[PDB]
């Protein structure tokens, strides 16, 4: 990508946001990987939308890129797992354990085992390290604090967390200029389309 094209994406992001196309904004953030939206991320973590969280993240990093991004996914998948246990859905809990958490075993064999053994407890709060986990709502919040730190320290996100600042509707203003440039090549004054250049 040029810096032109990169900046153009940012213009598009501002425009989309102003027109309140919220979901389109975040798909673009994700697919371009140019800007990571904290506010959005927080909102989705609180909502427990893990599918979307991992999908949004996937635009910026893979699980094994670095120790920061590795702990980020681990924390997310752990909370996913505990929530599954907490609603007593052991079918889902095992699915998560094999599909999501097994990749971390290679690097930590012992933790994976300890986490696996939580399946057999009446309440995972019987484990002393987890004896403090009081709510789905509260746990997500605690975890979110940790994710924000991990993200802000992550070198792959470090330059992606602050939107540039522009006067409102910068793209609309630029478009306006292209219309001024087209019609200043007209003979006399004094619209129709953006699809082909405007003339008289």
């Amino acid at each position: 990508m040029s810096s032109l094209s990169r900046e153009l994406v940012f213009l598009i992001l501002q425009f989309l946001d102003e027109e309140k196309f919220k979901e389109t904004v975040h798909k673009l953030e994700q697919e371009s990987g140019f800007f990571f939206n904290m506010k959005y991320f927080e909102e989705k973590v609180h909502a427990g939308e893990w599918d979307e969280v991992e999908k949004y993240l996937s635009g910026f990093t893979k699980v094994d890129d670095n120790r920061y991004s590795m702990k980020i996914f681990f924390e997310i998948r752990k909370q996913k797992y505990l929530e599954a246990l907490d609603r007593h859905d052991r079918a889902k809990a095992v699915d998560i354990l094999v599909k999501d958490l097994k990749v971390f075993s290679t690097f930590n064999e012992e933790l994976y085992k300890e986490i696996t053994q939580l399946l057999t407890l009446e309440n995972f709060r019987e484990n002393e390290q987890l004896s403090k986990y009081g709510d789905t709502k509260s746990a997500r919040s605690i975890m979110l604090i940790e994710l924000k730190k991990l993200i802000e320290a992550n070198p792959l996100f470090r330059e992606k967390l602050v939107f540039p600042t522009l006067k409102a509707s910068r793209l609309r203003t630029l478009i306006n200029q292209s219309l001024n440039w087209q019609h200043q090549l007209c003979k006399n004054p004094r619209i129709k389309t953006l699809f082909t250049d405007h003339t008289c």
Partner: peptide
Amino acid sequence: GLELSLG
């Protein structure tokens, strides 16, 4: 640093 853990 950033050791994975239960807590």
